[PDB]
Design a binder for these strands. Structure first.
Ligand code: CL
Ligand code: CL
Ligand code: CL
Ligand code: MN
Length: 196
DNA sequence: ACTTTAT
DNA sequence: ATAAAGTATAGTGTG
């Protein structure tokens, strides 16, 4: 089984949908693969207030801590949302407790390397095809918000090697992705079209 | 390395 | 006029 770890940049205009979907606020889902009978099985790993939006939480955190007087730019990357997962076979092997420990462990990796107070949310979904986590990492450091500074080319190449290794050291049997892999990312909807 | 942003 | 942070990046799977 491969360790699946990948980030998507979230601007203020993305976080509204990310909040509503991650929290499962609508009863109907366009995703035919969400099982609403299973949604009460999901859980959140941070101690965040569920009544507070991601955009509000993150903006408040950055404004209250940033060293500059200048406003957060309208196009700022407020957080990097990491999907943490593996394949179906990997999770088939694990009980509820081990599965939670798996996501808590991925989360510790990012807390330890990028700052505990930067893990804005850690939403574990068990109501879709495969257990996975949406974890929002605020790229905030030395009083500055900059995804550019935190997750550059060398950093993403480091995580692909070091994250699977850290999971392995903590008891999880999965390997890193292919080094220099030539895969092109497809969206969930695109990937589904690919399969049949 | 080239633009966009908010001073 | 300036400079920080915007643009991708690295990885696999039905997020
Ligand atoms: Cl909160
Ligand atoms: Cl200032
Ligand atoms: Cl999609
Ligand atoms: Mn999900």
């Amino acid at each position: 089984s491969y360790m699946v770890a990948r980030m998507q940049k979230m601007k203020a205009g993305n976080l509204g949908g990310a909040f509503k979907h991650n929290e499962r606020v609508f009863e109907t889902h366009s995703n035919k693969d969400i099982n609403p009978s299973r949604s009460h099985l999901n859980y959140e790993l941070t101690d965040r207030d569920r009544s507070v939006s991601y955009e509000k939480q993150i903006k408040d955190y950055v404004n209250e801590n940033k060293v500059s007087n200048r406003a957060i730019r309208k196009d700022a990357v407020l957080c990097d949302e990491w999907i943490i997962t593996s394949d179906k076979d990997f999770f088939e092997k694990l009980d509820e407790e081990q599965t939670r420990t798996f996501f808590e462990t991925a989360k510790n990796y990012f807390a330890e390397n990028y700052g505990e107070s930067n893990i804005a949310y850690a939403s574990v979904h068990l109501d879709e095809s495969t257990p996975h986590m949406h974890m929002g990492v605020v790229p905030f450091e030395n009083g500055k918000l900059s995804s550019k500074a935190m997750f550059d080319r060398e950093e993403l190449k480091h995580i692909q090697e070091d994250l699977p290794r850290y999971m392995s050291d903590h008891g999880f049997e999965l390997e890193r992705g292919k080094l220099n892999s030539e895969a092109k990312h497809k969206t969930v909807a695109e990937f589904k079209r690919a399969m049949a």
